[PDB]
Each structure stands twice: as structure tokens, then as C-alpha cells.
Amino acid sequence: PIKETDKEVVLTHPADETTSVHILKYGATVYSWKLKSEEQLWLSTAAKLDGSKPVRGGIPLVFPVFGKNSTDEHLSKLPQHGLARNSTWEFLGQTKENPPTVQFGLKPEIANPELTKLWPMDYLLILTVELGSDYLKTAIEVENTSSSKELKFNWLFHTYFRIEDIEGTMVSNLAGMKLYDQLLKESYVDKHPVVTFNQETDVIYQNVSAERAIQIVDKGVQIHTLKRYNLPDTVVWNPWIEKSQGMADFEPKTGYQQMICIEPGHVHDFISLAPGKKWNAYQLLCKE
Numbered sequence: 336p337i338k339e340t341d342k343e344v345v346l347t348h349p350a351d352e353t354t355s356v357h358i359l360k361y362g363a364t365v366y367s368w369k370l371k372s373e374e375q376l377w378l379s380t381a382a383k384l385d386g387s388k389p390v391r392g393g394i395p396l397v398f399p400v401f402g403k404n405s406t407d408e409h410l411s412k413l414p415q416h417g418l419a420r421n422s423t424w425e426f427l428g429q430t431k432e433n434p435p436t437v438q439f440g441l442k443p444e445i446a447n448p449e450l451t452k453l454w455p456m457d458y459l460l461i462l463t464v465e466l467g468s469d470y471l472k473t474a475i476e477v478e479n480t481s482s483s484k485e486l487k488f489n490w491l492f493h494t495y496f497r498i499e500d501i502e503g504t505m506v507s508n509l510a511g512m513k514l515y516d517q518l519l520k521e522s523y524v525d526k527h528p529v530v531t532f533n534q535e536t537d538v539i540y541q542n543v544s545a546e547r548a549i550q551i552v553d554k555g556v557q558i559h560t561l562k563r564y565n566l567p568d569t570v571v572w573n574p575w576i577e578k579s580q581g582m583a584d585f586e587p588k589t590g591y592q593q594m595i596c597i598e599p600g601h602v603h604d605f606i607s608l609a610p611g612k613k614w615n616a617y618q619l620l621c622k623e
């Protein structure tokens with residue numbers, strides 16, 4: 336079933352109503368995904384769900400710029416990670432009962448007014464969210480609705496996976512890939528056979544295809560699998576102690592121990608869309 340309220344849309348799977356996903360209209364932000372009652376995503380207990388600022392947790396949507404830009408006249412005006420996660424999207428309706436599937440839309444006319452004035456480019460976004468019995472698929476389509484101007488953008492899903500304990504966690508299938516380390520400010524190949532975590536981590540992997548599933552492992556158990564289409568980059572991030580402490584909307588302060596962000600995106604360069612052209616991609620979360 337699919338239920339709409341003033342602030343959100345909630346999907347429950349017909350075969351098992353304890354499998355569910357909650358999507359805030361603000362940012363079209365998935366903030367909970369339960370699989371047979373078990374929460375899959377990390378959400379700060381102090382996250383704002385009231386539209387006052389981006390949600391600290393779940394799956395914030397990053398568009399049209401990942402990070403902070405300092406090279407483009409207009410993109411450099413936007414705050415870190417763009418304006419999609421700061422704007423209230425329109426609920427376009429349900430498209431299927433089983434698996435429950437819904438769509439959300441964004442265009443400048445309904446987006447964050449302040450930020451739209453800073454980056455007055457035309458676009459149409461449609462997010463499709465499909466709740467399977469054992470997966471969550473979040474798909475995006477971007478259309479350049481301008482008749483004359485090229486549309487230049489990044490897209491990323493800022494996925495906060497819930498885990499039991501970060502220091503026991505490893506991430507597989509990234510061995511041998513090139514990354515840019517945003518902390519050390521250098522690029523290098525990951526020569527570790529798995530990724531482990533004992534400090535702040537903020538890295539951007541390049542060249543991951545639809546064929547490479549990334550797995551999150553704890554106690555020899557594969558607790559999450561991330562698949563994607565058309566998102567060649569993967570950001571891996573954990574704020575660790577100090578940064579967690581400095582984020583007012585991040586609670587509990589030990590909460591970095593129960594999350595890892597593994598964020599599929601197109602962020603290494605900008606996508607350029609000619610007038611009337613479209614681009615699409617998705618992230619697919621599951622368990623193998």
C-alpha cells in the first residue's frame with residue numbers, strides 16, 4: 336500500500352507490510368527503509384524532518400553540484416551539494432501497486448527560491464522509488480527543458496547505510512580502483528583487498544560499472560549490496576569522532592559507529608545535456 340500525508344509518502348510491501356520505505360517530500364528524501372521490520376538506513380536522532388535544512392541521514396539527493404564548486408560562475412554560488420536536498424519536491428503519484436512504486440518531481444518553479452535565483456538553470460527531475468520484497472530502487476531522470484542552453488550537472492545519491500559497528504565493517508569490491516582522497520588531497524589506487532575504517536574517511540572512487548556490486552560485510556555476513564546504473568563514481572564517507580561532534584544535527588555522537596555512506600554518483604566530471612535531452616540512472620540496494 337501507498338499512503339500520502341502533508342509531509343511524506345509511505346510505501347508498504349503488499350506481501351509483507353513490515354517492509355516499508357518513508358519518503359519526505361522535502362528533498363524527496365528517503366529517510367527510512369525497513370526490510371521485514373529491520374531498518375536499513377542510518378538516520379540521526381537529531382535530523383531535521385521539518386524542511387528547515389537537509390536531512391542528516393537516509394538518502395539525500397545531490398544535484399546539480401557535488402561538494403563545493405569554485406570554478407563555475409553559477410555553480411560556485413550554491414551551497415555544498417546543491418539544491419535538490421533543500422527543495423520540496425512534488426508527489427506525482429503512484430505508478431504500480433506491486434512492487435509499490437511512486438514518483439516525485441522537481442523543476443525551478445517549485446524549487447528552493449533563494450537557491451534557484453543563484454542557479455537559474457532550467458531542468459525537470461523525476462525520482463522513481465520502487466520498494467521490492469528484498470530491495471529498494473531509487474531511479475532518477477534529468478531532462479534539459481531549455482530550448483537553447485546546455486545543462487551542466489552532477490548527480491549523487493548520498494546513501495547512509497545502517498550498520499552495527501563500523502570498526503568491524505569491511506567494504507568489498509573496490510580493491511584496485513583509483514580514488515581521490517578529499518582529506519589528503521591526493522589521488523591513488525586502493526591497494527587494500529577490502530576497505531576498513533579506523534578514522535575519518537572521505538574518498539571518491541572512479542570507474543564503477545553496472546557489473547560491479549559493492550558489498551558491506553560484518554561478521555562474515557553480507558549485510559548490504561549496492562548496485563547501480565550510469566553512476567561511475569562512488570563516494571565513501573564516515574565523519575568519525577570530531578566531525579560528528581561538530582554537526583549539531585548529528586546524534587548520538589557515537590552514531591558514526593552505526594553508519595557508512597557509500598554514495599553512487601556522477602561527480603568526477605559534469606554531465607552536459609543538450610536542449611531537450613535526457614539522462615537517467617539508478618541505485619539499487621539489496622541483500623545477497
Ligand SMILES: O=P(O)(O)OC[C@H]1O[C@@H](O)[C@H](O)[C@@H](O)[C@@H]1O
Nearest residue numbers: 389402415416517537572574578
Ligand atoms: O554536511 P553535508 O553538506 O551533508 O555533507 C557531508 C559531507 O560531504 C562530503 O562530501 C564532504 O567532503 C564533507 O566535508 C561533508 O561533511
